């Protein structure tokens, strides 16, 4: 089907290497970097939506980062 | 011997006057146990076999479709019903189609069209259960002393060799004695049931590739699933997620299959251990066992011999392992029968005062013919030192320089401790666990914190927990209340998990 | 004394294929490198192929441009050499050989170091194949 | 279909099913039917022999077939022998039978 | 010793109905599986059907496409096999069989997959003739 | 409604799930549930069947 | 004073108690079965509770069978049966906490 839940959630932790230990970091970072590269203007829209919410600067930068992580996965 | 080069070995030294030592054995490395006046024994886990697994719930990862059929009804007449809908081997979908005066039925509402297609599955992946009983571990131990460098990884009829022994350990017989002829016997009481979690791990096969899969990932998977007994013409209780009923326009319906699905399963599996299969049994090569070592019936073969005084030649010469130890392979020229080799690390060759520590066993050559070979390894002092072998005026000496001061050794020891705790969880408190009260208190409070941490986090993977680690780091950095330390504490745990894989 | 026994040799038309086999007994087959060597009638010995203990490393001489495939079954103590697109130059007697010298240093027989000390101490009687 | 034997010798009757899970023969049972007599079971669970059945009869099994061995043949032994096992989880099936003279 | 006795076998026309019966005594009938097996004249043994202690589970071979109906009365120690639409292929001796190996499971109810068995207690069998 | 020849199956404490061959028929109503088993029914283990 | 064997090793009930089935090889007539739950086999200290009774083997034959159930402690433990150098032992692990 479409979903097929990822197994890295229940990562079997032991001294030997797991099935695909070479690809996790690059996997997530590559997906985010590619999607943001393709559609830039959503960076502007996310900046606006973050700026309208949150009083101090820290809250606004955190909301910006969370929007830019929640959009590429369409989670 | 058998542990010289493994590059992941740790020395377990000392005991309650020789009574017993706790030891955790892992697949990656091995443990060399050295006592006060007893031969150094190297223990290593080799393979873990699982036996008579019971098949459960096999999935389909490649569909095949067959003779489609369809039926339609008048705008008012009711709903479509194909006579192949009463068969548990056909997928059938019902929808609405535009009709009227053109196709054959006079009225203009939407109709109803049913399409059915036969499903055939070529390939299926099966999941099998593993009970923590009938699970066999195979431990191999060997002894230092008299074996030359060749017999380090040489696997042959080790029943005769008298220096290396093999022990099977199963939940039905957790206690075993390894009889090392002339050295006595190493008593070994071990805990196989609590080894590695084996009540949540299914053994998963697709096509000659076998994995260890966590249950709750082999139940929340969306594919056509049978259940257990394969008897005749199978039936899959899904009929969805592998056949796509794509609609056309103007009452046209089409049925397609999704292709072969064996690429999402290979990438859905990430962080699930690999395994291999022999016959009906499954050899896992990644595990974790905890054996208490009752070494109080080990003797020393070499004592009461007279020491050799002929000559010694350093043939393969001295070499440095990854941990600091120094392996030396000596050849003896004299024909003095069974004899005792004098070897001592020394500096200031004016007065040979023994320094360093000799991690061998009872050194001794057992051959008697003409020229014999022997291998012994020494733990040298940090400064410059001389390896001295021989009695008098014919002593062969070699110069040895070891790198890092005691502070470096302590820091590397703490790094090893951090890695071992991060990998083993609570059990790591039992590595050198002669066992006191402080160690038990540590084990307890770490067990509580571990249960809590695994209950809150631990539904996250490398990237996700690096994220939550940085976020909690900021939040604790500028919260200004008294809980900051708490939040900062969390970072360590979470972040250290990432920088030890 | 280890005995190597060759099997499967026979006359074949040019372009044919043949699967030669070798039976070993009396030594740790699973831990030794194995070789196939050949000798044309009235000609010298010509090295053909070698395989390590597991089969992960297969080496062939330059004359065989991928025509031949060497393999082994450790549990059966058997060595196989499958030969395709045979020509008249392939008419020869093939000896199945054990590498005993390498076993002295590398008891695992797996690591295929460059320029390692070797010796093909045990030979079979050889099987005759004629591509005619 | 049939096997011939001499008094005092040993005879083996084989039972083979084609491509059945490679499990089946663990549960094969062997039954004896003398001419005009009610059938009697000599072997159950593949290799276990009931009490009262002579130790003369023995059984063996593999991943591909099952075998019934009768050593020291007697004139009584001449009879029809039938193997039986599961066809599926809910079924039972008897073999073609072998007439031992 | 246990003795099984068949009854009800007789000549009947093709397409007729016939009810075979089996009387048991000398053991806990209410706890053993029961089987009906058949053997054609001059032919081999052919398994027909099986039933549990309570009568909950009933298994039939492939050749019986619902023609046969097995039942029992534990209080009377009786077994029954109803037969409808008889043909010539079924003329044979029917043996009533007790299943004691299951009686591991002294209840005789739970119909596990591939459970151990072996049929040693048989009746003399009753002849049915479809002519 | 009228009902007919009931049947059942059960396969252990630690095996898969029960499967009748009459579940692949569109004329039978079938229900799957859990039952207590072990040491008195035939299978050595004590979970829910 | 004989040796004991585990026919089917141990079962674990839902409530945590362990059922063991022991087979006796010797012939001493009716005699007590020495059984307990222990940790640190060096010094066998009774930990846990043995909820059966004074275990006995009634028959006096070559091989006899008996069953007893014991209540383990929450840690890892060993089921010990027998007296000396022939005592069959098993490893048993219970999940819960008090
Ligand atoms: C691992 O061990 C094998 C042999 O196994 C051992 O053989 C004896 C020496 C005993 O110690 C046994 O307990 C044990 O099973 C090593 O292989 C051996 O290598 C030697 C190399 O010197 C071979 O010797 C040859 O034959 C004769 C001596 O028998 C000499 O005259 C020759 O000149 C020649 O040296 C020996 O045949 C060979 N044996 C086998 C079975 O292969 C192996 O090298 C060693 N590996 C490691 C890593 O140490």
From TrEMBL, chain A:
Localization, UniProt: Host cytoplasm, Host perinuclear region; Host endoplasmic reticulum membrane; Host nucleus; Secreted
Subunit and interaction comment: May interact with host ANKLE2; the interaction may cause defects in brain development, such as microcephaly. May interact with host SRPRA and SEC61G. Forms heterodimers with envelope protein E in the endoplasmic reticulum and Golgi. Interacts with non-structural protein 2A.
Function: Plays a role in the inhibition of host RLR-induced interferon-beta activation by targeting TANK-binding kinase 1/TBK1. In addition, recruits the host deubiquitinase USP8 to cleave 'Lys-11'-linked polyubiquitin chains from caspase-1/CASP1 thus inhibiting its proteasomal degradation. In turn, stabilized CASP1 promotes cleavage of cGAS, which inhibits its ability to recognize mitochondrial DNA release and initiate type I interferon signaling. Required cofactor for the serine protease function of NS3.
Protein name, entry field: Genome polyprotein
Annotated organism of origin: Zika virus (ZIKV)
Residues of the full protein shown: 216 to 290 of 3423
From TrEMBL, chain B:
Localization per record: Host cytoplasm, Host perinuclear region; Host endoplasmic reticulum membrane; Host nucleus; Secreted
Organism: Zika virus
Part of the full-length chain shown: 291 to 791 of 3423
Role played: Plays a role in the inhibition of host RLR-induced interferon-beta activation by targeting TANK-binding kinase 1/TBK1. In addition, recruits the host deubiquitinase USP8 to cleave 'Lys-11'-linked polyubiquitin chains from caspase-1/CASP1 thus inhibiting its proteasomal degradation. In turn, stabilized CASP1 promotes cleavage of cGAS, which inhibits its ability to recognize mitochondrial DNA release and initiate type I interferon signaling.
The protein's assembly and partners: Interacts with the structural protein prM/E complex, and the NS2B/NS3 protease complex. Homodimer; in the endoplasmic reticulum and Golgi. Interacts with host TYRO3, AXL and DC-SIGN proteins. Interacts with non-structural protein 2A. Interacts with host HAVCR1; this interaction likely mediates virus attachment to host cell. Interacts with host NCAM1. Interacts with host HSPA5. Interacts with Aedes aegypti SRPN25, APY and venom allergen-1 salivary proteins; the interactions do not affect Zika virus replication in human endothelial cells and keratinocytes.
Highest taxon in the source lineage: Viruses
Disulfide bond entries: 3-30, 60-116, 60-121, 74-105, 92-116, 92-121, 190-291, 308-339
Name assigned to this protein: Genome polyprotein
Transmembrane segments: 456-477, 483-501
């Amino acid at each position: 089907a479409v979903t097929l839940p990822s197994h890295s959630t229940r990562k079997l932790q032991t001294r030997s290497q797991t099935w695909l230990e070479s690809r996790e970091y690059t996997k997530h970072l590559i997906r985010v970097e590619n999607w943001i590269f393709r559609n830039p203007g959503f960076a502007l829209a996310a900046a606006a939506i973050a700026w309208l919410l949150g009083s101090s600067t820290s809250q606004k930068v955190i909301y910006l980062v969370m929007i830019l992580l929640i959009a590429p996965a369409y989670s | 011997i058998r542990c010289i080069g493994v590059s992941n070995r740790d020395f377990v030294e000392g005991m309650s006057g020789g009574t017993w030592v706790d030891v955790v054995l892992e697949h990656g490395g091995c443990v060399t146990v050295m006592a006060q006046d007893k031969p150094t024994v190297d223990i290593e886990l080799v393979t873990t076999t699982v036996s008579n697994m019971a098949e459960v719930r096999s999935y389909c990862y490649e569909a095949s479709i067959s003779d489609m059929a369809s039926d339609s009804r008048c705008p008012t007449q009711g709903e479509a019903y194909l006579d192949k809908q009463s068969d548990t081997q056909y997928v059938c979908k019902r929808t609405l189609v535009d009709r009227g005066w053109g196709n054959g039925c006079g009225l203009f509402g939407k109709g109803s069209l049913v399409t059915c297609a036969k499903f055939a599955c070529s390939k299926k992946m099966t999941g099998k259960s593993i009970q923590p009983e009938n699970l066999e571990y195979r431990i191999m131990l060997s002894v230092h002393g008299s074996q030359h460098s060749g017999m380090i990884v040489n696997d042959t009829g080790h029943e005769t060799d008298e220096n290396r022994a093999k022990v099977e350990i199963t939940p039905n017989s957790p206690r075993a004695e390894a009889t090392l002829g002339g050295f006595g016997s190493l008593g070994l009481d071990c805990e196989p049931r609590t080894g590695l979690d084996f009540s949540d791990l299914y053994y998963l096969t697709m096509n000659n590739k076998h994995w260890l899969v966590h249950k709750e990932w082999f139940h929340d998977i969306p594919l056509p699933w049978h259940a257990g007994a394969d008897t005749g013409t199978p039936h899959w209780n899904n009929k969805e997620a592998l056949v796509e009923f794509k609609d056309a326009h103007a009452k046209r319906q089409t049925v397609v299959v999704l292709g072969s699905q064996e690429g999402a399963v290979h990438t859905a599996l990430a962080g699930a251990l690999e395994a291999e299969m022999d016959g009906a049994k499954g050899r896992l090569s990644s595990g974790h066992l905890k054996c208490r070592l009752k070494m109080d019936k080990l003797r020393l073969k070499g004592v009461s011999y007279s020491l050799c005084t002929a000559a010694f030649t350093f043939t393969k010469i001295p070499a440095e392992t990854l941990h600091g130890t120094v392996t030396v392979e000596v050849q003896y020229a004299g024909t003095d029968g069974p004899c005792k080799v004098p070897a001592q690390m020394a500096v200031d060759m004016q007065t040979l005062t023994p320094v360093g520590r000799l991690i061998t066993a009872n050194p001794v050559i057992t051959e008697s013919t003409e020229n014999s070979k022997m291998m012994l390894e020494l733990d040298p002092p940090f400064g410059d030192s001389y390896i001295v072998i021989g009695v008098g005026e014919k002593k062969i000496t070699h110069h040895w320089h070891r790198s890092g001061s005691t502070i470096g050794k302590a820091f590397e020891a703490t790094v090893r401790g951090a890695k071992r705790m991060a990998v083993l969880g609570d059990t790591a408190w039992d590595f050198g666990s002669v066992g006191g009260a402080l160690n038990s208190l540590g084990k307890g409070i770490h067990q509580i914190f571990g249960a809590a941490f695994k209950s809150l986090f631990g539904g996250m993977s490398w990237f996700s927990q690096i994220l939550i680690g940085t976020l909690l780091m900021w939040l604790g950095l500028n919260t200004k209340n008294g809980s900051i330390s708490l939040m900062c504490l969390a970072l360590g745990g979470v972040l250290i998990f990432l920088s030890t894989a | 004394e280890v005995q190597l026994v060759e099997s499967g040799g026979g006359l074949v038309r040019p372009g044919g294929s043949l699967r030669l086999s070798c039976a070993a007994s009396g030594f740790s087959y699973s831990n030794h490198w194995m070789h196939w060597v050949r000798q044309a009638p009235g000609k010298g010995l010509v090295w053909v192929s070698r395989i390590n203990s597991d089969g992960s490393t297969r080496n062939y001489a330059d004359f065989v441009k991928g025509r031949f495939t060497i393999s082994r079954d450790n549990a059966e103590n058997t060595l196989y050499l499958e030969m395709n697109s045979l020509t008249a130059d392939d008419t020869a007697v093939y000896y199945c050989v054990r590498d005993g010298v390498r076993f002295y240093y590398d008891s695992t027989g797996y690591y295929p170091d460059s320029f390692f000390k070797y010796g093909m101490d045990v030979w079979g009687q050889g099987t005759t194949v004629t591509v005619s | 279909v049939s096997v011939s034997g001499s008094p005092g010798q040993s005879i083996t009757i084989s039972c083979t099913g084609t491509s059945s899970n490679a499990d089946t023969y663990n549960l094969v049972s062997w039954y004896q039917q003398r001419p005009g007599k009610a059938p009697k079971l000599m072997i159950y669970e593949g290799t276990k022999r009931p009490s009262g059945v002579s130790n003369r009869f023995s059984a063996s099994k593999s991943a591909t077939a099952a075998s019934l061995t009768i050593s020291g043949l007697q004139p009584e032994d001449e009879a029809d022998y039938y193997c039986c096992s599961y066809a599926t989880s809910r079924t039972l099936v008897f073999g073609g039978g072998t007439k031992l003279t």
